Design a protein around this ligand. Structure first.
Ligand SMILES: Nc1ncnc2c1ncn2[C@@H]1O[C@H](COP(=O)(O)OP(=O)(O)O)[C@@H](O)[C@H]1O
Lengths: 108, 246
């Protein structure tokens, strides 16, 4: 449907960008750590590196810092099978049931 | 991945329950492409991470993969991440149990399209699931194999309509489920059989510790009339070897 982004980045800098995006999110050891799983629909690659309590805007910041391909491309994440979308980007993970939930990069 | 299973909640494979503290303990990937294994060498892929109705350490699977890959409720369910598969193009138009109970029509728009919520069927091309609109008891065997491995399909392209009914005999004709419990108490010699087939049981590693395999060839001795077909088929679908009886 919509235009996507191919593998335009270097293979040797993807792990460095993933480490930079992992270090961008603050890590606290006083909370039960929730492993938020994100899979993008631009080829099937998927990573996970997160803390316990954050926001959906922090997930968008993690996606922007992970790769420079979809940083400027408009994208709306979603959860599969409530038939719902992921609005209210300032909401936390526990209130909107984002505890390790399905995140699918959908391009509009 | 060896853990106890939850009881049934719904009757759809397009909704699957979830145990989130156990996924916090384990490592499972996203959603639609997650492998589950088990009996009869049957690898299966469907959705997880969708409903979250039950509690931790027990997860509901669909009934068509409750009877398949296990024996009953209370068994050990296993999970496996199988991501990054490709996209298929309109798997089966052909159901195999209840085509004549009703009307054919377009043969895939009638029953698949009211009964999905963007779950584009990542099931084995030849595997079963009950799907119909009203009566909700129509299985299928997939004949359209546009992707080779376990893959989801693209949303709503066009295919042919060559679906014809067959009697539902294929699963117990070719993949008849038998286990250790399905032979009526031969454990004086069933243990000996299990000892003899354990080195064929997916194990090349102990062949250097055994020298030559003591099963060069095994003879079954029994009275005329006891039957040996299911006894010889017991190692089929428990080892996963190619049976090919003649
Ligand atoms: N020891 C046994 N345990 C369970 N079923 C048996 C046993 N012996 C015979 N049968 C039954 O006899 C029937 C016909 O036997 P046959 O097909 O000749 O070989 P097999 O006995 O290996 O199945 C089968 O339906 C099978 O269930």
């Amino acid at each position: 449907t919509a235009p996507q982004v191919l593998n335009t980045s270097s293979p040797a800098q993807q792990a460095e960008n993933e480490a930079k995006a992992s270090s961008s999110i603050l890590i606290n050891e006083a909370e039960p750590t929730t492993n938020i799983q994100i899979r993008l629909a631009d080829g099937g690659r998927l990573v996970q590196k997160f803390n316990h309590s954050h926001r959906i805007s922090d997930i968008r910041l993690f996606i922007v810092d992970a790769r420079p391909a979809m940083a400027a491309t408009s994208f709306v994440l979603m959860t599969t099978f409530p038939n719902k979308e992921l609005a209210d980007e300032n909401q936390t993970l526990k209130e909107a049931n984002l505890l390790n939930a399905v995140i699918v990069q959908r391009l509009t | 991945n060896r853990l106890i299973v939850d009881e049934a909640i719904n009757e759809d494979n397009s909704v699957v329950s979830l145990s989130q503290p156990k996924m916090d303990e384990l490592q499972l990937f996203r959603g639609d492409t997650v492998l589950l294994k088990g009996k009869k060498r049957r690898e299966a892929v469907c959705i997880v991470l969708s409903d979250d109705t039950c509690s931790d350490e027990k997860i509901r699977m669909n009934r068509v993969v409750r009877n398949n890959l296990r024996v009953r409720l209370g068994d050990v369910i296993s999970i496996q991440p199988c991501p990054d598969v490709k996209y298929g193009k309109r798997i089966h138009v052909l159901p195999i149990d209840d085509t004549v109970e009703g009307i054919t029509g377009n043969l895939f728009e009638v029953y698949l399209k009211p009964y999905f919520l963007e779950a584009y069927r990542p099931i084995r091309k030849g595997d079963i699931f009950l799907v119909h609109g009203g009566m909700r008891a129509v299985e299928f065997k997939v004949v359209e194999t546009d992707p080779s491995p376990y893959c989801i399909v693209a949303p709503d392209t066009v295919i042919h309509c060559e679906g014809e009914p067959i009697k539902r005999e294929d699963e117990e004709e070719s993949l008849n489920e038998v286990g250790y419990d399905d032979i009526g108490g031969c454990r004086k010699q069933l243990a000996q059989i299990k000892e003899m087939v354990e080195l064929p049981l997916r194990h090349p590693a102990l062949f250097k510790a055994i020298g030559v395999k003591p099963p060069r060839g095994i003879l079954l001795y029994g009275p005329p009339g006891t039957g040996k077909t299911l006894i010889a088929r017991a190692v089929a679908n428990e080892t996963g070897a190619f049976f090919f009886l003649i």
